[PDB]
Nucleic acid binder design. Sequence first.
RNA 1: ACGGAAACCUUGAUUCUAACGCUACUUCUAAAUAAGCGUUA
Length: 48
Amino acid sequence: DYRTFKLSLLTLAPIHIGNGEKYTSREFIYENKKFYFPDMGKFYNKMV
RNA sequence: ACGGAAACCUUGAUUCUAACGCUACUUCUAAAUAAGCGUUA
């Protein structure tokens, strides 16, 4: 009594779904032609 | 020097045996972390 469909989604453009949170500029590094988002806990552990 | 004297209403006995506060029941129902970019330059 159940019908199952498969929906294949091909993005034709950028698609953003947020969670309400935002990276601040004190949280990512722009270098080597890339944006690096480190883990803040790991960064702090290496910085202590 | 009294129809009086002497004489335990006393001994032994478990208010005990058996028995599920149990049977059935979805913390469930819909819901894009999303909308607006004006005016000046």
